[PDB]
Design a protein around this nucleic acid. Structure first.
Length: 231
DNA sequence: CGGACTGACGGG
DNA sequence: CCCGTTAGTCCG
């Protein structure tokens, strides 16, 4: 924590650490991260305390503060970094895509990636759909499952603005993956989009290959709409 | 497989 | 209060 705002946050969080809670919290993330043991409601209040005392740093320091928090060992600091990014939301634009990519592929797990993709990247590609093809093909072709998950989930909240052809093309590229985080993301995005257009999702899952997990997750609700044919 | 439950977080 | 959801564990 070079930056004084980050140092203040580190000190304040550490003073309220809970080693008893940190153990199960770390186990929940498969022990990929150390935890201080601070859950979301308190963690947000502790951040708020520091903002009240120091004020939110000038936007010139935004990316710097995020990266410094990203570099700290305990997972709460990445969660706090994401809370802070939201506070700078109106300053984030298409020029930040590489910055967001780097966040996705460092300290990677489902918690951070899910908090970056459908919101920050989703909003950017909604305003600049013409940039999708500058990134999505690379993400799918990469060795990185989190970039692949990003390609699937960036349209999660699009509803009626969903690009169906694009969605199904992306899923087609990834449908053979044996990776849980890919199979489940496919299930999730289809389940969610089915809330907007159930007929299109139903037809897709009945007529295109998917991992068993992806298909069952996709239709967990809409199977009530159409029924389950006797085998 | 995949269903039932555990659970913290989001938000109607 | 309601119910949705990332995950997670447990079991036939």
């Amino acid at each position: 924590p070079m930056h004084p705002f980050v140092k203040a946050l580190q000190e304040h969080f550490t003073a309220h650490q809970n080693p008893e809670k940190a153990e199960p919290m770390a186990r929940y993330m498969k022990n990929h991260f150390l935890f201080l043991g601070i859950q979301t409601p308190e963690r947000r209040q502790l951040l708020k305390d520091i903002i009240q005392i120091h004020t939110l740093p000038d936007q010139k320091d935004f990316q710097i503060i995020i990266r410094e928090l990203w570099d700290l060992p305990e997972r709460e600091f990445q969660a706090a970094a994401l809370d802070i990014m939201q506070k700078y939301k109106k300053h984030i634009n298409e020029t930040h895509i590489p910055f967001l990519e780097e966040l996705i592929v460092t300290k990677s797990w489902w918690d951070s990636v899910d908090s970056i993709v459908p919101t920050f990247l989703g909003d950017i590609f909604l305003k600049h759909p013409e940039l999708i093809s500058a990134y999505i093909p690379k993400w799918i072709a990469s060795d990185n499952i989190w970039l692949q998950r990003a390609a699937i989930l960036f349209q999660l909240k699009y509803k009626q603005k969903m690009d169906e052809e694009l969605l199904f093309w992306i899923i087609g590229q990834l449908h053979s993956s044996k990776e849980f985080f890919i199979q489940k993301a496919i299930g999730w995005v289809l389940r969610e989009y089915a809330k907007t257009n159930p007929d299109v999702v139903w037809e897709y899952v009945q007529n295109n290959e998917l991992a068993p997990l992806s298909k069952r997750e996709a239709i967990k609700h809409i199977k009530q709409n159409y029924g389950i044919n006797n085998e």
